[PDB]
Structure formats: structure tokens, C-alpha cells
Amino acid sequence: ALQTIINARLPGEEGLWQIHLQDGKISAIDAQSGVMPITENSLDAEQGLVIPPFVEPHIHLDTTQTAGQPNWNQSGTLFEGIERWAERKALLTHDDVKQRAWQTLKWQIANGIQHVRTHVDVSDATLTALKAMLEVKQEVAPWIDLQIVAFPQEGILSYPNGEALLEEALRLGADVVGAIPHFEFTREYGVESLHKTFALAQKYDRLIDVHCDEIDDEQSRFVETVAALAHHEGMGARVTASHTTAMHSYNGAYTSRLFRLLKMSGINFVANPLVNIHLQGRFDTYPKRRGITRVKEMLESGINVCFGHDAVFDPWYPLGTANMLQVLHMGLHVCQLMGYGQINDGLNLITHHSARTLNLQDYGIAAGNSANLIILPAENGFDALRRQVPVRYSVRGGKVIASTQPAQTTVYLEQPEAIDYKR
Amino acid sequence: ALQTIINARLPGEEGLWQIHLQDGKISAIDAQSGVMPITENSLDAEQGLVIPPFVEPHIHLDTTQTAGQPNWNQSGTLFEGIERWAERKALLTHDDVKQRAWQTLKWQIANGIQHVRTHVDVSDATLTALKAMLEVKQEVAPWIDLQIVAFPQEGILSYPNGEALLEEALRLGADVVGAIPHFEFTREYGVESLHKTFALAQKYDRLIDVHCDEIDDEQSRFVETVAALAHHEGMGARVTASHTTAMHSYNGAYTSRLFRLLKMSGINFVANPLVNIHLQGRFDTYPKRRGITRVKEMLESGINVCFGHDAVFDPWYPLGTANMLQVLHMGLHVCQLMGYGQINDGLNLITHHSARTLNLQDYGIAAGNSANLIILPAENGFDALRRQVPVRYSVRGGKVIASTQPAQTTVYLEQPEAIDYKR
Ligand SMILES: [Fe+3]
Ligand SMILES: [Fe+3]
Ligand SMILES: [Mg+2]
Ligand SMILES: [Mg+2]
């Protein structure tokens, strides 16, 4: 079994490091004064970057891999996506959900993602997707720790037996309580749904992740209730507000007032760059707003924010390979976090900040933690992001669970020359 | 020498095709009724997609590869970029420009780009970068047909001897006349500069490519003069309006009136997604506009529009590997061209439409044309874009000039499994 990771670079640290492994955990981390020789039981990072696993804080595995079945969304709109999904209803079975969820999970394993939070639609009396996902969670456990959010897609108060189904999902084992206040029939139902959501989370000791204000409506301010209730219950760490795209459209004075509460509450925020840029701003003609939440300002204020892929190869987002560096690339551009340091520190948005959002207790390259880490063939976060590098090795419990042999590019000039896209 | 390309898929066509080569040209193209066996002198596309070479219609090779030298742009702003570039002035020499231009050109060759249009700053009495680029053009000719735009970055009428230097650049061999009307001191200088630009293009029989209305100013309408002058001279095919980001902010009524002229004029448009999303909208707080020209509407109106990378690894854009599928990916998202067909047809924005913009006369997979083509290991444009595939082979004059052995990813579950990110 592997005993050491050598010649490792670490974010924010100078030089090379050696990570000692014992009994599936990191026993010690020591600096090196030079390059160490390879040997049996040593995994050579080759001066590449070693980081804790990538995290997917927000994805919908119940709808993944269904784009084009039976027809393609040709307009690319949300409306048509709903219709295309409805045409596939006859194929939505227990086995179908498991098969598609596993397909995307395999892409995630290949992409060094060892933690995934999936939302599952529970506005279905049969809870078909949920039952399937609970089995998938057990099956994929050796490679990925999967959290399941009971997501009442059609609303809690605006759908028949919505609250009862949400609670049933928790009784069956869902890890997180979801909600969608802006989709409820009225603002009052929206606020009330949040009180019910928090009551359920406290009753069952579960986390909370609300699809919050995902709409270009400057009056959609459910985020203040999410933050206020979290602060009241002293449970900010266990709470997440996903999307909050409406915040992109708030006036600055209200946003400034709100930010004080957001910081005090300690809640987490998830932005989904690939889907937000695609689905937001659809009611604008020109100019067209970007529609991503205030990521830059959150970072400047010390508010925890991270990035999710949201959807992969489905009616609402036809693209994706479940790659977090790709999600990060889109977010840095749309949020204008393009300074060198902002880009370099970007890795935090798909690693540490996301681990905090999932309330993970065993995460990070530190003595005592499980030996879960990945190796990127790049010098730092900036380099990894610029070159969209693959994951050279993914290690879990001190064992390699994924590896990618890099592509080899050659140009034939007066003489053949290898191209690695580095200067 | 290669005699045939077999098992090739072609955009918009059904089945597989065989492309016969003779004397460096495509002699004939015949459909296949099944998979053909490989053999000596046959390049097997392996049911991958064969297309004419990728094109880079807008890049700045004179500033490429300079990010972080001597310092990094930490704010990521245009303003700081100017200051960071100024700090490197002592390193701006003939050899330095050639070295950096060649570095990016090699990345382009590796990425299947055989046609490149580079703008070169000619607001320099010594014309240092231009002299260097003219040598680079000759040196890279076996692999890339490089067009040089004499770009008067500081203005034609607003910079000392600006017009004289622009003409000197043409007398030295620049292929295209550039301009930047919105940067001139006054609207009047802007309009006058365009008359001077067109006069020079007609005097020397050169193409035109204007950095046009690259500013979030709803009153910046120099594009109407570019189109009107082209129509008057009957030279639309030889004219290009780069950027036109101001169009993102025009009212709809004026835009509708303008579009009639744009279509009638026949001029070309270049949008630069990666840089536009980064540099536009910087004077907005929230909401923030996207700032890309009206690509979707141009396509719907039959107006030729294409995508450029603009900058690579410099003070104005720190990222990039000179990859056109990456540029396309960003543009499809920001312009909301996310329907299946829109994404699949996306390849036109980095191939055929760009060739038209460069007024290329030998481009496309057709009998009689030079055997210049590339092979993507994907089923169609949608697949190539989704998976951000590399260029398996780049062929020029019937000879392989670049090749990429794909990365190999394996996940170790109960048994090892190869992952190709296809469903
Ligand atoms: Fe979601
Ligand atoms: Fe430019
Ligand atoms: Mg969604
Ligand atoms: Mg520029």
C-alpha cells in the first residue's frame, strides 16, 4: 500500500512537500528542501499540485444524462426543457435513475470529485427517484460520499401533500432538507415554507439547502429569511442558500444591509456558473444581465461561497462532463475574478469552500485526516485552471481510485516538437 | 504520402465519407456505405469528424505570453493591464516579439488552427512589433497563413503621425487596415478616421478590420459608418467590424434599422467571448451586462459573425491556450445559443464563418481545394464542444503537421474501467 506522496506542491505554500500515509490516514506532512527520489510505495506528485478532493456541492443526478431523450431541446429554453422531460416520463424508472446517476458519478470519480451533494425531486408521491438515489448512495460510498437533498421542486405549500412528502423523504434518509420559496404561489407561502423547512431540519437534525431566489426578480428576497432563521437557531454552518441569482439584480443599498446579516448568520452560498449564465437573463432583451449571485463581494466580505455544476447533459443544461475546473473557469469569467490572485485562489471555490458548504468533518491535507487527496499536473491553481488539466491521480483512503495519463500533443515543424501549453 | 482520409463524418451530412487526396489537394469526396478498412497511405478518421482547419480571426500576437512580466495584473482591470505592460517596455525587442508570437503560434498549430489574423500595434514610430511580425509571417507560412492587421491602437487622428504610420505599415506589407474610432478624441475624428481607413484599403487593395465600438456606450455607432462605406465601395466581403460590444447596449429600434444596412453591406463581424465577458460591463455595478455583440440575431439574419480568442496569456487576458473550442464554449453560453442545433452548428463560428471573415479563397472540404483539414475525435459539433476534444490530426497540403494522442482516464471500481465521458 502507498506510504508516501512526494514532491507535492500545496496551495499558498512555498516549495515541495512530503505527505506520509498510515492506516488510510495522513500521518504527517513535512517540507522537502529539494526533489525526493521515487521508490516503492511512493506516489510521485512530480512537483504537481496536491489538494483535498474536488467537491460537487450542487447537482441533479435524478435528471442527468437525459438530454435528447426522446427529443432534443432545440430552443434551449427552460420552458422547452420542461416539455422535453415530460416526453421521457415513460422511461423514468428505478433502474433508469440508478443507471444515469452512476454514469455521471463515474465521470465525477474520474474528475477527482469525492464529495457530491445531489438534489432529488420529492414532489412525487411515489418518490421513485429518491428510492433509487438512496441505493446509489450506498453503492458509490467506497468512492464518493453522496449527500441527498429532499428537493420539493413543485413547492412545499403549493403542491399536494408537499410538506408530508418532504418529511417522508427525510424519514427515508435524505441528508438535507430542501425548499424553493420563489416558486411557491405567493410570497407568504414562500416565507412560511422556510419556517417549515427549518422546523424539519431541527426535528431530524439534518442540513438545509434552499433553491433560493433563482429568478431575475429584484423583489425575491427569501435569502434574508434563510439567513435570519439560521441565525436565530444558531445553525448557520448547516445551512446553504443555492443560486440567489436575484441578488444580481438587487439595489446596492439593500444588498449592503443584507450582507451584515449574511456574515453574522454564517450560512453558505452556492453559485452555479454554467447554468446561471445560460438560464438567467432570459427575460431581458439587450442589454442582458449575467445573473450570477454576488460572488466577488461575498469573497471580499468573508462570506462562504462556492461553485456547483448544477446539471449535466439534461434538458435544462445539455452540456458538461462534470468537471469542476470547467465550472470554475466559467465562474471566474462571469464574476470578473480575473486578477492573477483571484484566479489562483479560485481552487478554493471548488474545494475548501464547498467542503464547508457540505459541513464536512474529514477534509483537507492535514495530519489525522483520511488520506483523500488528488494530484493535478500543474504548478498552482492558476496553471491548473488555465490549462484545464485532468486529475493525474485521485487517492481515497490511501489508495488510488482514478488516474489519467495525459494527452500527448506533437507538432511537426522542421523537427517534431512536444507541446504542453506552458511557456 | 497520404492518399486517403477514410471513415470521416462531415457536418450536416449523413454517414461516413472518403476523402481522396492527390498532389496536396482534395481530388474527390465519396460517400461510404459502411466502415472502410485501414491500409498504407490511409489516415483513418475512425468515424470522427473531419472539418476544414480552425481559424483565429482576431488575436494580438504582439502582446501574447507577457502576463506576469515583470509583475502580475492583480486587479484584472484594463487600467492595471496598461500599467503592467508599461513596466515591461525594456524587454520589448524584435527577438522578444518573434519568440512570444511563435510560442502562441505553436499552440495554435497544435490546436488545428491553420489561419490566423493578428492585429499589430502601429502607434509606434519604430514599428518594432510590425517588423518582427512580418518575419514571423514568412517563417510560419508552411503551417499557418498569417494575416497582419496594421492596428493604430492609439488612434489615427488622435496620435502623432498616426495616419502616416498606418500607411507606412501598409507599405511594409500589412494585409489589413485597422482603426479604432471609439478611442479617437471625438466622434468627428472617429468618423473621419474611417474615411481615411477605407481610402487606404482601396489605395493598396487591402482588407479592413476595425476595432469597432468596443465600449459599453449606447451612443458609439461607428459600425454604421463601417457598413455604409463598405456598401458604397461595394467591398463588404473585404471588411470586418471587430467587437461591436456597444451593440449589446443599443435600443432595439435603432438596432432593427441598423440590421438592414448590416445585411445589405455584406461586412463581417468578430465577437471575442473570452475577453468581452471579462472586460465589458466593468462600469456597471449590479446588474451587470454581458457585453457581447448581437451574435444570435446576426445568425438569425444571415449576417456573417464568428469568434476570436483576442488575447492569450497577457495583461488584458491572463488565460488561454489558444483553443477555439474553448472560445466557442464561452460564446455559446454568454450568447445563449444553447439549443442542441445551435450548439451543434457552433463549429461554423470557428471555421467557415471565420474563413469568410478572412476572405479566404482556398478553404473547405471540396474537390480542388488544398488538402487542409483536421480530424476531431467526436461524432459531431455538439459532441466535440461538450467534451472539449483535442485535434487528433491536423493535415496541411496532404501532410500531417500535428497530432494528439488522447488522454487515457481509468477509474478503479470493483474492476478498472475506462472513462471517455460519452454516455
Ligand atoms: Fe438545482
Ligand atoms: Fe483586438
Ligand atoms: Mg435547476
Ligand atoms: Mg483588445
Coordinates of C-alpha atoms in Angstrom, one line a residue, chain A residues 82-358:
Chain A
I82 CA -39.9 21.0 -19.1
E83 CA -41.7 19.7 -22.2
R84 CA -38.8 17.5 -23.3
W85 CA -38.5 16.0 -19.9
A86 CA -42.2 15.2 -19.8
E87 CA -41.9 13.3 -23.1
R88 CA -39.5 10.9 -21.4
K89 CA -41.8 10.1 -18.4
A90 CA -42.4 6.5 -19.6
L91 CA -38.6 5.8 -19.2
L92 CA -38.4 7.2 -15.6
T93 CA -37.9 4.0 -13.6
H94 CA -35.9 2.9 -10.5
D95 CA -33.3 1.2 -12.7
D96 CA -33.1 4.2 -15.1
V97 CA -32.4 6.7 -12.4
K98 CA -29.7 4.4 -10.9
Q99 CA -28.1 3.9 -14.3
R100 CA -27.9 7.6 -15.2
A101 CA -26.8 8.7 -11.7
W102 CA -24.0 6.1 -11.8
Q103 CA -22.9 7.3 -15.3
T104 CA -22.4 10.8 -14.0
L105 CA -20.9 9.6 -10.8
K106 CA -18.2 7.7 -12.7
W107 CA -17.3 10.9 -14.6
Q108 CA -17.1 12.6 -11.2
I109 CA -14.7 9.9 -9.8
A110 CA -12.6 10.3 -12.9
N111 CA -12.5 14.0 -12.3
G112 CA -11.3 13.7 -8.7
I113 CA -14.6 14.5 -7.0
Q114 CA -15.1 12.5 -3.8
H115 CA -17.9 14.6 -2.3
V116 CA -21.2 15.2 -4.1
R117 CA -24.5 16.8 -2.9
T118 CA -27.4 15.9 -5.2
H119 CA -30.8 17.3 -5.1
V120 CA -33.6 14.8 -5.7
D121 CA -37.2 15.8 -6.7
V122 CA -39.6 14.8 -3.9
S123 CA -42.7 16.4 -5.4
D124 CA -43.7 12.8 -6.5
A125 CA -45.9 10.7 -4.3
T126 CA -44.1 7.6 -5.4
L127 CA -40.7 9.0 -4.6
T128 CA -39.2 6.9 -7.4
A129 CA -36.0 8.9 -7.9
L130 CA -35.4 9.2 -4.2
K131 CA -35.6 5.5 -3.5
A132 CA -33.2 4.9 -6.4
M133 CA -30.8 7.5 -5.2
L134 CA -30.7 6.1 -1.7
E135 CA -29.4 2.8 -3.1
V136 CA -26.9 4.6 -5.3
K137 CA -25.6 6.4 -2.3
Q138 CA -24.8 3.1 -0.6
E139 CA -23.3 1.6 -3.8
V140 CA -21.0 4.5 -4.5
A141 CA -19.8 5.0 -0.9
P142 CA -16.3 3.5 -1.5
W143 CA -15.5 6.3 -4.0
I144 CA -17.9 9.2 -3.2
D145 CA -19.6 10.4 -0.1
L146 CA -23.0 11.4 -1.6
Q147 CA -25.4 13.7 0.2
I148 CA -29.1 13.6 -0.8
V149 CA -31.2 16.8 -0.7
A150 CA -35.0 16.2 -0.5
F151 CA -35.9 18.9 -3.1
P152 CA -39.6 19.8 -3.2
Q153 CA -39.4 21.0 -6.8
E154 CA -43.1 22.0 -7.1
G155 CA -43.1 23.7 -3.8
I156 CA -43.9 22.7 -0.2
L157 CA -47.2 24.6 0.3
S158 CA -48.0 24.9 -3.5
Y159 CA -48.1 21.1 -4.3
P160 CA -50.5 18.5 -2.9
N161 CA -49.1 16.9 0.2
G162 CA -45.8 18.7 -0.4
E163 CA -44.9 19.0 3.3
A164 CA -45.8 15.4 4.0
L165 CA -43.7 14.2 1.1
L166 CA -40.8 16.3 2.2
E167 CA -40.9 14.8 5.7
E168 CA -41.3 11.3 4.3
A169 CA -38.1 11.9 2.3
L170 CA -36.3 12.7 5.5
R171 CA -37.8 9.7 7.3
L172 CA -36.4 7.6 4.4
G173 CA -32.9 9.0 4.9
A174 CA -32.4 12.2 2.9
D175 CA -29.5 14.1 4.4
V176 CA -30.6 17.6 3.6
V177 CA -33.9 19.5 3.7
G178 CA -34.6 21.5 0.5
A179 CA -37.1 24.3 -0.4
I180 CA -37.9 26.6 -3.3
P181 CA -39.6 29.7 -1.9
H182 CA -39.7 31.8 -5.1
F183 CA -41.7 29.0 -6.8
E184 CA -44.5 29.0 -4.2
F185 CA -47.7 30.6 -5.3
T186 CA -47.3 33.6 -3.0
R187 CA -44.6 35.5 -1.1
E188 CA -46.4 34.4 2.1
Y189 CA -46.2 30.7 1.1
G190 CA -42.5 31.3 0.4
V191 CA -41.8 32.7 3.8
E192 CA -44.0 30.0 5.5
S193 CA -42.3 27.2 3.6
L194 CA -38.9 28.3 5.1
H195 CA -40.3 28.1 8.7
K196 CA -41.4 24.6 7.9
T197 CA -38.1 23.7 6.3
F198 CA -36.1 24.9 9.4
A199 CA -38.5 23.1 11.7
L200 CA -37.9 19.8 9.8
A201 CA -34.2 20.3 9.8
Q202 CA -34.2 20.7 13.6
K203 CA -36.6 17.9 14.2
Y204 CA -34.5 15.4 12.2
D205 CA -31.0 17.0 12.8
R206 CA -30.4 17.5 9.0
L207 CA -28.7 20.1 6.9
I208 CA -30.6 22.7 4.8
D209 CA -30.1 23.7 1.2
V210 CA -32.6 26.0 -0.3
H211 CA -33.1 26.7 -4.1
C212 CA -33.2 30.4 -3.1
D213 CA -34.3 33.3 -5.2
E214 CA -33.3 31.6 -8.5
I215 CA -35.1 34.3 -10.5
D216 CA -34.3 37.7 -12.0
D217 CA -36.8 39.4 -9.7
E218 CA -35.4 42.2 -7.6
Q219 CA -38.2 41.6 -5.1
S220 CA -37.3 38.0 -4.4
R221 CA -35.6 38.3 -1.0
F222 CA -36.2 34.9 0.6
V223 CA -32.4 34.8 1.3
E224 CA -33.0 37.2 4.2
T225 CA -35.4 34.7 5.9
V226 CA -33.0 31.8 5.3
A227 CA -30.2 33.8 7.0
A228 CA -32.3 35.1 9.8
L229 CA -33.8 31.7 10.7
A230 CA -30.3 30.2 10.7
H231 CA -29.0 32.9 13.0
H232 CA -32.0 32.5 15.3
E233 CA -31.4 28.8 15.6
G234 CA -27.6 29.2 15.8
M235 CA -27.2 26.7 12.9
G236 CA -25.5 28.7 10.1
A237 CA -22.9 26.1 9.4
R238 CA -25.6 23.6 8.5
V239 CA -27.4 26.0 6.1
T240 CA -26.9 26.7 2.4
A241 CA -28.7 29.1 0.0
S242 CA -28.3 27.8 -3.5
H243 CA -28.4 30.1 -6.5
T244 CA -29.5 33.5 -5.1
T245 CA -29.4 34.8 -8.6
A246 CA -31.9 37.5 -7.7
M247 CA -29.1 39.1 -5.7
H248 CA -27.5 40.0 -9.0
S249 CA -30.5 42.4 -9.5
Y250 CA -30.8 44.0 -6.1
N251 CA -30.1 47.7 -5.5
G252 CA -26.9 48.3 -3.7
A253 CA -28.3 49.8 -0.5
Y254 CA -30.4 46.8 0.3
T255 CA -27.6 44.4 -0.5
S256 CA -25.2 46.3 1.9
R257 CA -27.8 46.0 4.7
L258 CA -28.3 42.3 3.8
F259 CA -24.6 41.5 3.8
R260 CA -24.3 42.3 7.5
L261 CA -26.9 39.6 8.3
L262 CA -25.3 37.1 5.8
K263 CA -22.0 37.4 7.5
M264 CA -23.5 37.2 11.0
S265 CA -25.6 34.2 10.1
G266 CA -22.7 32.1 8.8
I267 CA -24.7 30.4 6.1
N268 CA -23.2 29.1 2.9
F269 CA -23.8 30.1 -0.7
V270 CA -23.6 28.1 -3.9
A271 CA -23.4 29.7 -7.3
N272 CA -23.8 27.5 -10.5
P273 CA -22.0 29.5 -13.2
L274 CA -22.6 27.2 -16.2
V275 CA -26.4 27.0 -15.7
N276 CA -26.8 30.5 -14.3
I277 CA -25.3 32.2 -17.3
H278 CA -27.5 30.0 -19.5
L279 CA -30.8 30.3 -17.8
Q280 CA -30.7 33.8 -16.2
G281 CA -31.3 37.0 -18.2
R282 CA -33.7 35.2 -20.5
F283 CA -36.4 37.9 -20.0
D284 CA -34.0 40.7 -20.9
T285 CA -33.6 41.8 -24.5
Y286 CA -30.5 44.0 -24.6
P287 CA -28.5 44.7 -22.5
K288 CA -28.7 41.3 -20.9
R289 CA -27.7 40.7 -17.2
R290 CA -25.3 37.9 -16.2
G291 CA -27.5 36.7 -13.4
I292 CA -24.9 35.2 -11.1
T293 CA -25.0 35.9 -7.4
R294 CA -22.6 38.4 -5.8
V295 CA -19.6 36.0 -5.6
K296 CA -16.8 38.6 -5.7
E297 CA -18.4 40.7 -2.9
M298 CA -19.1 37.6 -0.8
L299 CA -15.4 36.6 -1.0
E300 CA -14.4 40.2 -0.1
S301 CA -16.7 40.1 2.9
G302 CA -15.6 36.6 4.1
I303 CA -18.9 35.0 3.3
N304 CA -18.6 31.4 2.3
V305 CA -19.4 30.9 -1.4
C306 CA -18.6 28.0 -3.8
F307 CA -19.4 26.7 -7.2
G308 CA -21.6 23.8 -8.4
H309 CA -22.2 22.3 -11.9
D310 CA -26.0 22.0 -11.2
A311 CA -26.9 19.9 -14.2
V312 CA -25.1 17.6 -16.6
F313 CA -26.3 16.5 -20.0
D314 CA -30.1 17.1 -19.4
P315 CA -33.0 19.2 -20.8
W316 CA -32.0 22.2 -18.6
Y317 CA -28.3 22.2 -19.5
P318 CA -27.3 20.0 -22.4
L319 CA -23.5 20.2 -21.9
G320 CA -20.9 19.2 -19.3
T321 CA -18.5 16.4 -18.4
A322 CA -19.0 17.0 -14.6
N323 CA -15.7 18.9 -14.5
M324 CA -15.2 21.3 -11.6
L325 CA -12.2 23.2 -13.2
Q326 CA -14.6 23.9 -16.1
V327 CA -17.3 25.2 -13.8
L328 CA -14.6 27.4 -12.1
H329 CA -13.4 28.7 -15.4
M330 CA -16.9 29.9 -16.3
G331 CA -17.4 31.5 -12.9
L332 CA -14.1 33.4 -12.9
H333 CA -15.1 34.9 -16.2
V334 CA -18.7 35.8 -15.5
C335 CA -17.9 37.1 -12.0
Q336 CA -14.8 39.0 -13.3
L337 CA -12.5 37.4 -10.8
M338 CA -9.7 37.7 -13.3
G339 CA -6.8 39.1 -11.4
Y340 CA -3.9 36.7 -11.0
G341 CA -4.5 36.1 -7.3
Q342 CA -8.3 35.8 -7.8
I343 CA -7.8 33.1 -10.4
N344 CA -5.1 31.3 -8.4
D345 CA -7.2 31.3 -5.3
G346 CA -10.1 30.1 -7.4
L347 CA -9.5 26.5 -6.4
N348 CA -10.9 27.3 -3.0
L349 CA -14.3 27.7 -4.7
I350 CA -14.3 24.1 -5.8
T351 CA -12.5 22.5 -2.8
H352 CA -12.4 24.1 0.7
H353 CA -15.4 26.4 0.4
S354 CA -17.5 23.6 -1.0
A355 CA -16.4 21.2 1.8
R356 CA -17.6 23.9 4.3
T357 CA -21.0 24.1 2.5
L358 CA -21.4 20.3 2.9

